[PDB]
């Protein structure tokens, strides 16, 4: 009885009629594949679970990555608890792509809401693909084939988390492994082959095939086409909630106003490989 | 009893306990008009109601505007038609308040949703009091006293109203009666007395006292800010929901995601006073 | 004799040893036409000419248009008196090619500078060909073919020019007759075949094949770039000056830095052909 | 000593002093108030040597020399630009010279040694023409705001290099020269007159702005503060000299003649914390 209901034309869509607590058939994981393919993005209601069962869900549509430095659920190490009274969240509130500074960015991720306040909090994602097939051919022409650098420094910069030396020293650390490097401005996804747009605000510095002034003007324009409502969902929390999405494809952003609230997240990270 | 839950900080929420199709009481006016003037939109779903009653519950807030152009019920023409058979809505998919070309702009509107797509054509609003309370210290000090210019013609263009003789003519009648006009970039609400932004992308070309170049520049920031996720909320319909905002102090936006699917929607708008 | 003295790489150059207040031979005037070609506005000092002598040596380089509207003098209606104390040239202080909404816009022009303020009131002329040239591949490969409507209303707006029952009846007649059009965003020059960046910020309103988002943020870049110092020239003028410039690949600015004192120019314009 | 205005928003020539000499305190005076109505000043056909150029500049504040570029040995105040040698291609970008530093330069003298036949001019704008145009409301918003310069703007990790000695040479420069704030509307220290005080080159963020604002704005006065009407464009000829002032201005040098030579010999004065 898995049914999925489309939340909007440009992506998302709502699953029910599974219980992911539990081992999912072959039928199932087969049915919630296709949907994110086509859909991107999907949630689930009313799905309590524990991290090992999250875990346990995930990796049927992927290997699993272990934070070394995030927080961690000590016998699920695939399960990273982001609890906002222990951990800082900043990087959340742009408009990103996960990790997109890294050669393989993630595949996915499955979120498990725990703890929310009253409200606040939504979470946003926009479609790259939507985006893509929205740009005027001639811009879409002119993009598909061209490059872009990505840089972790600029969602973290020297400027906030290298404020004391403890802090310094981390990122300096950072920077040292991970140099800006190149991506796509325009990425086929490497199951469905659809084309998406594979900039974003949090990472991207450069289209490395047009000058600083052109580039500059070029992102701009990029940033706020592919984040426009056409493109875009709104998810409002709940607990107990599940969102599973293909980090590929997708941009998020995670609304901060819901301070000094507490709210509790569960995540596991699906790895990813190269994006071309 | 009447329940009112906020869907986001910023604004929004959704009433219920309220039967809309009958006379509601005093106490139930004043609870929904408080809710107002907190929460700026709010939403009833599962509110079948026919334009009688629509209009009767909208004239408990206001005095209700008769259209003299667009299609209306005609035993109840306070109440418009908003079709797809009968009406195309190119000038919704960019956001606005409505009528601040007026010098008396509309005080809000009951929206009531008859028949829909199966998805898509959500409605965003975005307040203007949390906007203008997030801006900076210097510019909301720098903004607050200064005036715009509001010009329907921004929205609705020569060449819309389009080719021969008598549509200059008939536009350059419009013109001379609804010539461009001026309200406070900085609005305060004449009932609860707060402050909020008060420009929209959709007419307004001109902050007065700045010169054009700088005039151009801090629009296209207004506009970005006051419609960035924190200050707003994204609505998904159903049939039979009502939405009733408050005109003085949001802007919306309507996306265009379900053409040409029908889509049909039956508005009641309430006078307005003059902003100061 | 004829000597040619460029001002700088991207354009310009002063032509002297040629006497224009007589009639100059074939041999002369095909030196200056190559000059033209070549650096694309000439300026000639210490070059006292009447009207009638203008108009007969613009005449060598094309057919000369008789203005309907503005000054002229009344022997040699094909110059025209631009005297601040009788007309205002206040929007000649924004980058601009002359009459680009027109579907021949001007071929180019000769003025000759009367009488001028001690200092201020300087001319800079921009390269449309050097301009198109420094854009990177992706860009040029983008734009060459792509179109763009030009609007005199843009440089006449009715807030302006509007305002007068009398003012208001010739800027509809103008109107009326003046439609928006089109031309090529990059323009081959009609004798030298060299391509040439053809928008301004005068006169262009919208690149035709892209959307409006999209239009606008390459407007604004290609403005900005088109006018960079790398190509463009700045002339400080002296009395008995003339300059001739070809409008079809260029743009220019008057510097509006000296008033109230009064600058007195005669210019003759060059009838020119449709862009392609 | 005649002075003439190139323009109303800056600029002025000079003649009728022989500045490869010493010049008399009231001379001195006359240019310094020259400097301070005007901004840039030019002299032409004022061919001088480096101890010249030292002696003339140091009568305007004390010289500084630089720890890097080639320099002028027995006058080693005096820095030789020398295209053949050194690369000034970043000289090609709206700047402020060194507002990364808490002090930056009071100024510069150059004198035009070598010269292609055209190309390489340079240009000025005034912060205070600039200031001054500002509509009302935003000069009282902008006066009173400070601004991040940060020499990382125009050199950035990738300007350095790739290599691990690269990378700590940078990090070494960093800590050397760490962000710092000016104020967005510099008051000029001895004329009082204010100015916009923010450059493309070093500015990266108003301090007292959110992120979104502050870049809106900046944009708005990088733009703004370098519209032809507050800008003069010099074409060079040899044995020219300019003589600015860094506090209220910024220039442009434009990068249109290689592989031509292009040599000119400057002195930097000393200058003081921006208010
Ligand atoms: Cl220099
Ligand atoms: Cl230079």
Redesign the interface.
């Known amino acids: 009885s898995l049914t999925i209901t489309?939340?909007?034309?440009?992506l998302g869509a709502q699953i029910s009629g599974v219980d992911i607590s539990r081992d999912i058939s072959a039928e199932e994981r087969d049915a919630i594949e296709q949907a994110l393919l086509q859909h991107q993005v999907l949630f689930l209601r009313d799905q309590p679970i524990n991290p090992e069962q999250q875990a346990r869900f995930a990796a049927r549509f992927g290997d699993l990555h272990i934070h070394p430095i995030y927080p961690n659920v000590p016998d699920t190490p695939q399960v990273l608890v982001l609890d906002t009274a222990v951990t800082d969240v900043r990087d959340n509130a742009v408009w990103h792509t996960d990790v997109t500074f890294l050669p393989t960015p993630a595949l996915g991720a499955v979120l498990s809401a725990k703890q929310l306040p009253?409200?606040?909090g939504?979470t946003?994602w926009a479609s790259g693909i939507a985006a893509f097939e929205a740009?005027?051919?001639?811009?879409r022409?002119?993009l598909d084939g061209?490059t872009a650098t990505h840089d972790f420094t600029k969602s973290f910069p020297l400027?906030r988390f290298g404020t004391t030396p403890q802090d310094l020293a981390r990122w300096?650390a950072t920077r040292?492994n991970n140099?800006?490097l190149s991506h796509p401005v325009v990425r086929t996804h490497p199951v469905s082959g659809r084309k998406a747009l594979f900039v974003n605000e949090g990472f991207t510095t450069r289209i490395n095939?047009?000058?600083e002034?052109?580039s500059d003007?070029?992102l701009?324009?990029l940033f706020?086409?592919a984040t426009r409502?056409?493109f875009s969902?709104?998810w409002?929390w709940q607990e107990n909630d599940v969102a599973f999405w293909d980090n590929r494809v997708t941009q998020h952003?995670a609304?901060?106003?819901?301070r000094p609230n507490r709210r509790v997240m569960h995540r596991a990270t699906i790895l990813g490989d190269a994006p071309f």
Chains 1, 2, 3 share one sequence.
């Open positions: 489309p939340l909007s034309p440009a009253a409200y606040g939504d946003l740009l005027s051919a001639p811009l022409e002119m061209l400027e300096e040292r140099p800006p095939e047009l000058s002034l052109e003007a070029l701009r324009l706020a086409h409502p056409e969902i709104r409002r952003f609304v901060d106003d819901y």
